[PDB]
Amino acid sequence: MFLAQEIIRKKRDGHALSDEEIRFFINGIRDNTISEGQIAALAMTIFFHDMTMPERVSLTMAMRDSGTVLDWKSLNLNGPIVDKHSTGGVGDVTSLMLGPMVAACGGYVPMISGRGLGHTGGTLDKLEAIPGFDIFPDDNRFREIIQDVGVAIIGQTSSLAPADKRFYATRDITATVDSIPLITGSILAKKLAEGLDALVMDVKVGSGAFMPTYELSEALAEAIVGVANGAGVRTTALLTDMNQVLASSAGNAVEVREAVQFLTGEYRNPRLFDVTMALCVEMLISGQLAKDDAEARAKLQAVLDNGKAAEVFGRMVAAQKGPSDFVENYDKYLPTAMLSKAVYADTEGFISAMDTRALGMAVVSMGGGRRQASDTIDYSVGFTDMARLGDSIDGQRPLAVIHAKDEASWQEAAKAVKAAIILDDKAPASTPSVYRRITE
Amino acid sequence: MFLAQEIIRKKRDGHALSDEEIRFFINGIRDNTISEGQIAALAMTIFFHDMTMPERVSLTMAMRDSGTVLDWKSLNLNGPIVDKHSTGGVGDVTSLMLGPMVAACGGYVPMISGRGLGHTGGTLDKLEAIPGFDIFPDDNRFREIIQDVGVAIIGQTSSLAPADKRFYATRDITATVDSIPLITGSILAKKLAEGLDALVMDVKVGSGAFMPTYELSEALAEAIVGVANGAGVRTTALLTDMNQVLASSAGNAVEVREAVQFLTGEYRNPRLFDVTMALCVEMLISGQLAKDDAEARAKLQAVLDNGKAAEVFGRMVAAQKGPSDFVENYDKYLPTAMLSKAVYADTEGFISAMDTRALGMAVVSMGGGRRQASDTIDYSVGFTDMARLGDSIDGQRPLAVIHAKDEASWQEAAKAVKAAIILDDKAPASTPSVYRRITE
Numbered sequence: 001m002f003l004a005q006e007i008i009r010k011k012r013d014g015h016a017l018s019d020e021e022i023r024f025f026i027n028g029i030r031d032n033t034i035s036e037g038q039i040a041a042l043a044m045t046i047f048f049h050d051m052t053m054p055e056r057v058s059l060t061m062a063m064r065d066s067g068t069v070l071d072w073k074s075l076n077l078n079g080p081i082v083d084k085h086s087t088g089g090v091g092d093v094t095s096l097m098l099g100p101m102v103a104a105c106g107g108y109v110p111m112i113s114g115r116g117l118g119h120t121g122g123t124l125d126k127l128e129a130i131p132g133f134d135i136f137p138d139d140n141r142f143r144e145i146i147q148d149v150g151v152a153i154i155g156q157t158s159s160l161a162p163a164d165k166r167f168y169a170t171r172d173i174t175a176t177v178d179s180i181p182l183i184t185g186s187i188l189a190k191k192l193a194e195g196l197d198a199l200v201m202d203v204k205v206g207s208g209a210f211m212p213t214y215e216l217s218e219a220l221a222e223a224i225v226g227v228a229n230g231a232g233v234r235t236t237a238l239l240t241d242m243n244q245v246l247a248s249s250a251g252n253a254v255e256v257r258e259a260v261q262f263l264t265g266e267y268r269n270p271r272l273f274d275v276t277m278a279l280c281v282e283m284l285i286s287g288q289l290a291k292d293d294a295e296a297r298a299k300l301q302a303v304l305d306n307g308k309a310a311e312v313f314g315r316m317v318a319a320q321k322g323p324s325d326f327v328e329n330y331d332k333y334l335p336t337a338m339l340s341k342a343v344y345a346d347t348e349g350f351i352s353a354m355d356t357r358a359l360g361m362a363v364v365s366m367g368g369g370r371r372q373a374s375d376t377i378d379y380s381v382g383f384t385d386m387a388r389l390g391d392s393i394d395g396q397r398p399l400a401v402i403h404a405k406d407e408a409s410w411q412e413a414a415k416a417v418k419a420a421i422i423l424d425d426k427a428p429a430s431t432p433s434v435y436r437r438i439t440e
Numbered sequence: 441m442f443l444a445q446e447i448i449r450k451k452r453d454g455h456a457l458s459d460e461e462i463r464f465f466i467n468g469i470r471d472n473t474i475s476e477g478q479i480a481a482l483a484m485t486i487f488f489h490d491m492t493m494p495e496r497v498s499l500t501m502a503m504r505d506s507g508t509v510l511d512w513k514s515l516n517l518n519g520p521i522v523d524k525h526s527t528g529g530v531g532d533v534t535s536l537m538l539g540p541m542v543a544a545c546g547g548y549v550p551m552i553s554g555r556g557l558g559h560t561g562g563t564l565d566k567l568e569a570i571p572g573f574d575i576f577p578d579d580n581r582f583r584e585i586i587q588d589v590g591v592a593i594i595g596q597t598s599s600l601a602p603a604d605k606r607f608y609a610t611r612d613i614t615a616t617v618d619s620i621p622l623i624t625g626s627i628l629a630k631k632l633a634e635g636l637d638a639l640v641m642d643v644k645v646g647s648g649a650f651m652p653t654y655e656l657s658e659a660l661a662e663a664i665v666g667v668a669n670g671a672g673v674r675t676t677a678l679l680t681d682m683n684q685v686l687a688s689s690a691g692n693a694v695e696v697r698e699a700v701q702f703l704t705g706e707y708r709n710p711r712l713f714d715v716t717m718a719l720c721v722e723m724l725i726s727g728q729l730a731k732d733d734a735e736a737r738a739k740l741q742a743v744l745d746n747g748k749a750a751e752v753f754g755r756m757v758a759a760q761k762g763p764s765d766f767v768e769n770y771d772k773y774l775p776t777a778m779l780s781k782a783v784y785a786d787t788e789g790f791i792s793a794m795d796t797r798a799l800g801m802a803v804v805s806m807g808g809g810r811r812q813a814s815d816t817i818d819y820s821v822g823f824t825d826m827a828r829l830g831d832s833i834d835g836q837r838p839l840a841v842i843h844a845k846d847e848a849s850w851q852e853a854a855k856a857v858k859a860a861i862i863l864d865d866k867a868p869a870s871t872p873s874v875y876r877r878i879t880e
């Protein structure tokens with residue numbers, strides 16, 4: 001039998017679907033009661049008529065409710081449940097510092113992530129560089145690590161918005177990926193199943209972005225903001241720059257290292273700090289832990305200054321089966337490439353642009369990520385000492401230090417790197433790291 | 441892989457397909473190498489954006505070439521391969537006389553007709569009320585029949601427009617049914633695959649029509665005329681009337697009986713005559729057998745009145761393994777319902793309107809139709825001596841005589857009929873049998 005067809009017919013003639021009906025349809029996407037054709041139809045239908053904000057909210061909550069949602073009340077905490085979501089990026093290690101910095105300021109951050117099949121390097125794989133680290137605690141242990149440390153970074157769940165999976169899969173063959181209320185839907189669902197009080201969204205801007213245009217990035221951000229708030233989750237969003245690598249390194253172990261050193265104070269990429277700081281501020285103000293930006297940045301600076309943030313990162317690692325002294329002796333534990341040598345340019349001048357995606361694939365082809373879904377990850381390879389847009393380039397200053405497993409992989413990695421970076425006789429201009437703050 | 445999705449995406453955002461693209465997509469349907477979701481999405485994307493005439497012809501020509509297309513060129517037949525297709529309704533028995541009448545005048549009529557699903561009762565169903573009648577002759581048998589008697593009415597093979605199968609199947613679940621070029625593609629394909637030199641289309645109008653409103657019934661006819669003629673087959677289309685039972689009987693055996701008495705001359709329903717004649721006239725003119733309408737009606741009335749048409753029907757039944765003397769001894773071969781008993785109105789007045797859809801549904805409920813193809817048809821059930829739009833009603837004017845399986849099903853039929861026929865003091869406006877003719 002099919003009541004779904006009525007629902008499709010309704011929305012097809014530009015009517016607005018009800019909460020009850022919206023919840024019906026996705027639940028049947030979950031259970032395979034609703035045919036694939038029907039789903040495609042609905043998708044193409046929503047692709048045409050768009051969706052009202054109430055429809056966007058209902059769709060999002062319904063998807064969020066297709067699986068388990070984490071309840072954090074009853075279990076007693078004096079603070080806000082807050083997380084960060086992001087459309088990802090090369091060098092974007094921010095969540096590794098940001099979780100502990102906020103946890104330190106009174107927030108409880110249950111960061112759930114998705115390795116998926118992502119071409120892009122995922123943070124979950126970054127943490128597996130750390131010997132012993134377990135990305136799959138059970139519900140109970142997860143509740144505790146949040147309860148004591150204030151942050152844990154864990155593995156995905158089928159228990160989280162399962163409807164989205166058949167939904168997305170169908171969307172992907174029917175040219176309906178590509179609709180804002182639908183994207184807003186697949187993006188927000190999983191993240192909202194964490195039972196958040198608050199949220200901040202990082203929408204990338206630039207060449208290396210999920211959204212190819214500033215206005216397009218800004219549009220998504222607004223949409224996401226409007227829908228998230230509408231679901232009783234205090235939310236804002238930031239556009240941030242992805243015209244180059246965000247950190248000074250790209251990979252796994254190597255990126256984990258940058259974060260310990262960011263938290264300890266040993267080294268803070270000024271752009272990565274700008275981003276990281278901006279995001280945490282949002283988590284604090286939305287979370288009702290800071291009155292304004294000045295207060296948040298003060299609270300934030302301090303936990304970086306007294307080592308209390310680095311401590312939280314350290315404890316977290318231990319809570320999750322890692323070595324308890326990781327912060328103090330990270331090099332002791334972090335896998336080290338066999339060959340680690342600077343790559344230099346075929347010419348002089350200033351870096352005027354970089355292709356972050358090419359760079360990102362250079363790393364992948366170095367064992368740094370997964371070409372095939374069955375491949376293993378070599379956690380030691382990556383780049384460090386990434387030159388930056390602006391940097392003057394001679395023959396004495398390297399584009400990067402390529403860490404490889406052997407000279408064969410190192411050399412290809414160097415051709416890829418030289419090829420992905422563009423030099424110019426005259427310098428390009430500064431841009432902010434953080435652009436617009438979006439409240440609604 | 442498929443590139444199917446790039447064709448979906450292309451029509452979404454409103455672009456022409458181009459045939460190479462369309463022919464490729466139709467075959468994937470037939471071969472099953474294209475997902476149900478991709479059929480749905482493309483149907484939906486067409487409902488929104490519609491198709492051009494070159495897209496319309498391509499669509500139909502493609503579905504038409506997905507199976508076998510019949511050729512009679514070999515047979516060296518003297519006259520035109522003609523046929524008629526109707527969107528049907530309660531009482532529409534026209535083909536039973538039309539085929540022998542047109543055959544009687546020089547045309548060859550290969551009516552391959554399709555199954556009764558779509559709800560309601562079919563032409564093939566009616567014919568099988570005849571003991572011995574076989575609707576599935578093999579390719580040669582069909583040919584030598586058409587060659588010798590000039591007309592055969594046979595059921596559909598696996599190989600006639602098989603692409604429409606899954607196509608319409610998924611359309612009917614996704615609410616992508618009401619699309620004229622989709623309908624025009626579906627309907628014409630099967631019929632154009634018969635090898636027709638010419639064709640007339642009977643598009644019903646009213647409460648018993650496929651289309652809801654007159655203007656849509658016109659729109660479809662126009663499309664069909666345009667495409668059929670586009671596709672290489674002379675074609676005209678008559679908007680005919682269906683606000684009441686066209687014949688005087690509804691059912692299977694009873695409708696066959698009426699066919700016989702129509703040809704011989706025992707009786708002819710005036711309105712059944714108008715439609716049957718006008719459709720046959722088109723076939724004669726479209727089919728190069730009459731220069732003008734008057735000659736056409738003259739050649740048809742002739743064979744209706746020299747017992748020729750009746751004899752052609754006699755030979756066609758016999759050819760298909762009906763009893764050879766059916767025209768003369770039909771009462772002996774057709775099955776008698778167990779209960780035949782009249783139904784009257786519960787109020788005096790004039791018949792102001794009747795729900796034809798409901799009436800047809802009443803007959804199916806009696807056991808004269810198939811809800812689910814598994815069902816057995818009781819061939820002797822139905823209505824006869826049907827009252828008409830306009831008639832005056834009093835205690836001795838029955839709405840109809842009902843042929844029911846038993847007392848239980850008769851009351852049920854009686855109640856449906858009462859509930860479907862509405863009376864009034866005021867005699868409403870008297871509409872024609874044929875509203876418009878379309879060659880343009």
Ligand SMILES: O=c1ccn([C@@H]2O[C@H](CO)[C@@H](O)[C@H]2O)c(=O)[nH]1
Nearest residue numbers: 526527557558622623626627650
């Ligand atoms: O595109 C379509 C849709 C329906 N039909 C069939 O034709 C009948 C009406 O002519 C319908 O009930 C259905 O059975 C077609 O031939 N083509």
Ligand SMILES: O=c1ccn([C@@H]2O[C@H](CO)[C@@H](O)[C@H]2O)c(=O)[nH]1
Nearest residue numbers: 688701706707708709824825826
């Ligand atoms: O409107 C109608 C319907 C049927 N009949 C006749 O009723 C008889 C039924 O046995 C046949 O002579 C048939 O022609 C009529 O006279 N008028």
